[PDB]
Amino acid sequence: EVQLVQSGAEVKKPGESLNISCKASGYSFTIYWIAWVRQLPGKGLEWMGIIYPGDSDTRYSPSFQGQVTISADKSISTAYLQWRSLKASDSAVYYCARGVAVDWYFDLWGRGTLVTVSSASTKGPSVFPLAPSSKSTSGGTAALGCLVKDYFPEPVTVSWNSGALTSGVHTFPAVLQSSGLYSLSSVVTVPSSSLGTQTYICNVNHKPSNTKVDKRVEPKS
Amino acid sequence: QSVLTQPPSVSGAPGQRVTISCAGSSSNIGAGFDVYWYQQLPGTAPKLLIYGNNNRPSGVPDRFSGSKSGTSASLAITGLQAEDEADYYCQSSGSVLSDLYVFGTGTKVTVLGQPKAAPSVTLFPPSSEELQANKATLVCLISDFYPGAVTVAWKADSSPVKAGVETTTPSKQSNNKYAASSYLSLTPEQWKSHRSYSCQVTHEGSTVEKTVAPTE
Numbered sequence: 001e002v003q004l005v006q007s008g009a010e011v012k013k014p015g016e017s018l019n020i021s022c023k024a025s026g027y028s029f030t031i032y033w034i035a036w037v038r039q040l041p042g043k044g045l046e047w048m049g050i051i052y053p054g055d056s057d058t059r060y061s062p063s064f065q066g067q068v069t070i071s072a073d074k075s076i077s078t079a080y081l082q083w084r085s086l087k088a089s090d091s092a093v094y095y096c097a098r099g100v101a102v103d104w105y106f107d108l109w110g111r112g113t114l115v116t117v118s119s120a121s122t123k124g125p126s127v128f129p130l131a132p133s134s135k136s137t138s139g140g141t142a143a144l145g146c147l148v149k150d151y152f153p154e155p156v157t158v159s160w161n162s163g164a165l166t167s168g169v170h171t172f173p174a175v176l177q178s179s180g181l182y183s184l185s186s187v188v189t190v191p192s193s194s195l196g197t198q199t200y201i202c203n204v205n206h207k208p209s210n211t212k213v214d215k216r217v218e219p220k221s
Numbered sequence: 222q223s224v225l226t227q228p229p230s231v232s233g234a235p236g237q238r239v240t241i242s243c244a245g246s247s248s249n250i251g252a253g254f255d256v257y258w259y260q261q262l263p264g265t266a267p268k269l270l271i272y273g274n275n276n277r278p279s280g281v282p283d284r285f286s287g288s289k290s291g292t293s294a295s296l297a298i299t300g301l302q303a304e305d306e307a308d309y310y311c312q313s314s315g316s317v318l319s320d321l322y323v324f325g326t327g328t329k330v331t332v333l334g335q336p337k338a339a340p341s342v343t344l345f346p347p348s349s350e351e352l353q354a355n356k357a358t359l360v361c362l363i364s365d366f367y368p369g370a371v372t373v374a375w376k377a378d379s380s381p382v383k384a385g386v387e388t389t390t391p392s393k394q395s396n397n398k399y400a401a402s403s404y405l406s407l408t409p410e411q412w413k414s415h416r417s418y419s420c421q422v423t424h425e426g427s428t429v430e431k432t433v434a435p436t437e
Contacts, residue, residue: 045324062319104314105257109267128351136343172402175387185360
């Protein structure tokens with residue numbers, strides 16, 4: 001069956017080089033045009049260029065002429081999109097797509113390759129307690145948590161009491177800040193009557209920085 | 222260069238009809254070039270849905286229909302089903318090289334498959350420990366709402382605060398409701414100089430506002 005299989009997500013710093021790939025199966029690779037299409041965060045699609053793999057004839061949109069190189073390797077039915085020097089504004093999802101004869105549309109698409117270009121360096125989190133509050137929880141319960149601030153890359157793992165506490169846990173998806181670093185919160189809802197007798201520790205693990213934090217969360221008192 | 226302008230979002234209940242507009246120009250749709258539509262289910266490759274303004278490929282149900290008039294085009298979905306919740310892109314072409322392919326800005330269709338659920342809002346002040354590290358983060362956590370669309374506004378005393386605010390896109394919880402979070406980054410001095418700070422969450426026309434103050 002016709003399929004276009006694109007390589008996985010990439011994370012690069014500005015000034016680095018990159019090539020991403022799209023492998024075609026299920027049809028004669030050399031007789032259909034392949035296009036690359038960019039989707040910037042929060043924007044629509046934008047065509048970048050197209051290549052005819054049989055003779056590697058390439059056409060570029062003027063915006064991207066000289067910013068990228070498109071190429072193809074017939075032997076392995078694969079097209080490539082290449083940057084010599086990446087910029088932060090190149091962060092986007094990049095799609096491969098198969099053009100149709102005569103008409104200007106695409107009948108087959110890849111899933112897209114996320115490329116992230118950031119000056120952010122691997123960094124472990126700082127963990128701060130969110131002291132229990134009963135103001136927005138149901139009667140007889142309190143919400144406490146930990147703020148996991150300023151780490152890169154995703155993900156961090158948060159457990160509570162070394163995984164003994166799982167009911168009532170809500171670890172929120174992280175926010176990406178303008179600094180390039182991530183922050184998230186994990187909150188657990190527990191009985192109010194337990195705050196004086198039960199210890200609550202959040203266990204935060206960040207493998208890329210080899211950082212591990214066990215933070216006690218106590219009432220403010 | 223050219224783009225086709227689409228509504229960012231469209232929603233409807235299962236079984237109803239919804240339309241997606243696509244605004245082009247005198248150099249693409251207005252000039253006689255055809256319009257195509259793609260459907261992109263979350264996590265999946267875009268799929269051809271409509272070609273030649275109103276033709277459907279095999280595998281595309283007859284619930285989808287397309288049309289073109291003047292400089293604009295439209296996609297209509299009848300008998301809206303859960304499977305239709307997806308991003309939809311129109312596409313045409315123009316006369317200049319940059320416009321060999323011209324795409325739409327994209328429309329997210331939401332299928333309202335469950336009743337409205339109101340958000341629970343939880344607001345945490347900066348921890349003393351974070352203040353000792355010369356930082357101050359207010360945390361506004363928003364949970365259990367449906368549909369998954371919210372806006373958050375912060376206030377210092379009674380005046381809006383835009384700087385230092387970062388807010389997540391809503392994501393689905395385990396119970397198929399949505400969660401989101403908003404963070405207001407301040408200096409310790411900003412935290413202590415103002416009397417109060419508020420997180421106001423707007424959802425489907427109603428608002429919930431929580432306030433904290435450094436003197437707590």
